[PDB]
Design an enzyme around this catalytic site. Structure first.
Site, mmCIF file in Angstrom:
data_model
loop_
_atom_site.group_PDB
_atom_site.id
_atom_site.type_symbol
_atom_site.label_atom_id
_atom_site.label_comp_id
_atom_site.label_asym_id
_atom_site.label_seq_id
_atom_site.Cartn_x
_atom_site.Cartn_y
_atom_site.Cartn_z
ATOM 1 N N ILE A 56 1.429 6.137 -6.381
ATOM 2 C CA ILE A 56 0.307 5.318 -5.940
ATOM 3 C C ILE A 56 -0.319 4.643 -7.154
ATOM 4 C CG2 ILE A 56 -0.071 6.758 -3.943
ATOM 5 C CD1 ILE A 56 -2.548 7.896 -5.478
ATOM 6 N N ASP A 57 -0.590 3.346 -7.034
ATOM 7 C CA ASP A 57 -1.147 2.568 -8.138
ATOM 8 C C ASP A 57 -2.665 2.617 -8.036
ATOM 9 O OD1 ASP A 57 1.409 1.962 -9.008
ATOM 10 O OD2 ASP A 57 1.488 0.081 -7.880
ATOM 11 N N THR A 58 -3.262 3.612 -8.687
ATOM 12 C CA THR A 58 -4.713 3.734 -8.701
ATOM 13 C C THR A 58 -5.380 2.735 -9.633
ATOM 14 O OG1 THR A 58 -4.884 5.332 -10.507
ATOM 15 C CG2 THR A 58 -4.309 6.171 -8.328
#
Ligand code: AN2
Ligand code: ZN
Lengths: 112, 461
Positions: A56-58
């Site tokens: 996941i690209d936080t």
């Protein structure tokens, strides 16, 4: 129930790098709530055993958040494009900025 | 170009460094390959800083490129924040696997098998591989950034695969014959020294007696030592006639501690109630799993067979009750085994290492189908001539020429020796005799002048 019962998915044209975006239509909240969520999202990424939970690209959670629009190339010299996916044939289902609060839709915000 | 794109795509490195910074990055967009070592990284400190754990930072951080890594450091006061490092080459699991091999905790032998070092003893298994148990055991000896990720089972499977695929060359095991391995260390025989811990690691001992060594019993004086001399004095009298047989007996007893190939086969010859099985039980209790009782198959039944494969690395094999091969309805010793059981590698994975002293007990003098001069060189016999009989039939035994002394039987010795009461005193005796005879050389001498069958050949001579 609002986010599970109504959502849409995008598919990228890059096969070596599986790039996907999932947008839940019937859920609405303020952006500061997203920024506060980023913490718990990082802990969930670190704790869960699901391989996708790692990726996941936080870092997208930032001032003036920008994302590639469906049907549009990432870069002028790059051909990785996010295309339409069934069963949602409406482009409005792939835009998080679009707000449509109906009876099934739910909205929430931080108390402070 | 301030970035060398020989390690990782600049976007991925920026994604990593942003992931480290839990707080939002203000000027994330302007970081490119030609400015990332120059522009300070201004950060919106909504949350506490991910590096210094403070409320915020007075001055922005900065990036540097060095040794194929990114160094994250704070401007202004350096000690006010923690230096951070982002690597760019190597799967982290490969680094962990390299560290684990680096310790020399896991090895492979010539058998295509993998031995591990768990709980101060070289464990080994074939049905259930146990590299992963080693990984759990060793995670305490690594930094935190490895221990945190050695917990998930699939990561351990990946590290095990890496270790499997990096351990190419085979090592030799069990090269020290004068070392007695326990489960908690190794006892040296040349000295009286006991090594417990990483000192026992250097001797790649893959077998053990099966019981822990205790320094409180292995002294010399012992509550049990005196009656142990009494028993050994009764079984083998300390007399001038039964004199040579005594040191022959002691040499045969001590040759069961050395982990080398033995050059003779010993026969315990004595009548009923002479104490041969007493010595069998004493040796079993004294050396644990290194002593094995086999059947008569490896003497009279074709070798090439669990009874010949279980003697792998055993230091003592004892054979019981040859059923009167002199009389009819019996199969002879077939000395081809005597040719076979002494040569260093036993065929019967059909190859096994021979470290076993072969001791056979009998009541009758045995016979071979064929008598050869190579049998002259590898057979010794021990005579037992003390009777331990019941009070009722003492006289009927005192008038027999097969006994030189008759003693009163004690019914409690079997239970006591079965309880390993004489476990350590007898081992002490074995060590004392080993230092007396087998230093610096271990070799066994035959006694051809004792077996009656060899008399006829001597009659030929
Ligand atoms: N020194 C001794 N004092 C008292 N009893 C003794 C003894 N040495 C041996 N015994 C006992 O007498 C018997 C002789 O030992 P055993 O090993 O069975 O004799 P054997 N049948 O193999 O010749 C055993 O029951 C043993 O417990
Ligand atoms: Zn800081």
């Amino acid at each position: 129930k609002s986010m599970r019962s109504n959502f849409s998915l995008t598919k990228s044209t890059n096969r070596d790098k599986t790039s996907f975006h999932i947008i839940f239509l019937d859920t609405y909240t303020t952006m500061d709530t997203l920024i506060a969520m980023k913490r718990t999202l990082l802990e969930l990424s670190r704790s869960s055993e699901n391989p996708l939970t790692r990726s996941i690209d936080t870092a997208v959670y930032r001032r003036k958040t920008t994302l590639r629009v469906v049907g549009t190339r990432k870069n002028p010299n790059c051909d990785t494009i996010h295309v339409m996916q069934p069963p949602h044939d409406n482009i409005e289902d792939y835009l998080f900025t679009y707000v449509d609060m109906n009876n099934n839709s739910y909205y929430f915000s931080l108390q402070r | 170009k301030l970035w060398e794109p020989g390690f990782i795509s600049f976007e991925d490195a920026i994604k990593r460094v942003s992931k480290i910074f839990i707080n939002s990055i203000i000027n994330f967009n302007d970081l490119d390959e030609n400015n990332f070592t120059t522009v300070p990284l201004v950060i919106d400190y909504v949350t506490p800083c991910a590096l210094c754990k403070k409320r915020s930072h007075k001055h922005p951080h900065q990036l540097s490129l060095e040794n194929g890594a990114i160094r994250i450091y704070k401007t202004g006061n350096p000690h006010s924040c923690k230096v951070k490092i982002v690597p760019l080459d190597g799967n982290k699991l490969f680094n962990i696997a390299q560290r684990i091999l680096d310790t020399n905790s896991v090895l492979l032998t010539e058998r295509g098998d993998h031995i591990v070092w768990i709980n101060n003893s070289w464990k080994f298994n074939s049905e259930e591989p146990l590299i992963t148990k080693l990984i759990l055991s060793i995670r305490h000896q690594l930094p935190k950034e490895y221990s945190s990720e050695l917990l998930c089972p699939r990561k351990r499977k990946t590290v095990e695969a890496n270790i499997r695929d990096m351990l190419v060359d085979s090592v030799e095991t069990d090269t020290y014959p004068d070392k007695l391995p326990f489960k908690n260390g190794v006892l040296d025989l040349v000295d009286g020294m006991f090594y417990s811990g990483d000192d026992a690691k250097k001797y790649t001992c893959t077998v053990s007696t099966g019981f822990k060594f205790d320094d409180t019993k292995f002294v010399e004086d012992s509550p049990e030592m005196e009656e142990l001399m009494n028993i050994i004095n009764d079984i083998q009298p300390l007399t001038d006639e039964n004199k040579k047989n005594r040191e022959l007996y002691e040499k045969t007893l001590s040759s069961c501690l050395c982990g080398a190939t033995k050059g003779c086969l010993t026969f315990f010859f004595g009548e009923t109630a002479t104490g041969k099985s007493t010595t069998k039980r004493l040796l079993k209790s004294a050396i644990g799993d290194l002593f094995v009782e086999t059947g008569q198959t490896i003497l009279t039944d074709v070798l090439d067979n669990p009874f010949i494969a279980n003697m792998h690395l055993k230091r003592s094999v004892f054979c019981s009750e040859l059923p009167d091969f002199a009389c009819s309805g019996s199969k002879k010793i077939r000395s081809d085994n005597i040719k076979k059981l002494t040569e260093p590698c036993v065929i019967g994975k059909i190859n096994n290492r021979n470290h076993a002293t072969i001791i056979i007990d009998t009541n009758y003098k045995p016979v071979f189908d064929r008598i050869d001069n190579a049998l002259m060189r590898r057979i010794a016999v021990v005579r037992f001539r003390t009777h331990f009989s019941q009070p009722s039939g003492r006289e009927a035994a005192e008038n027999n020429d097969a006994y030189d002394k008759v003693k009163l039987l004690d019914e409690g010795l079997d239970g006591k020796i079965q309880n390993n009461r004489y476990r350590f005193a007898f081992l002490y005796l074995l060590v004392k005799w080993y230092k007396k005879y087998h230093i610096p050389i271990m070799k066994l001498y035959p006694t051809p002048e004792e077996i009656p069958d060899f008399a006829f050949y001597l009659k030929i001579g």
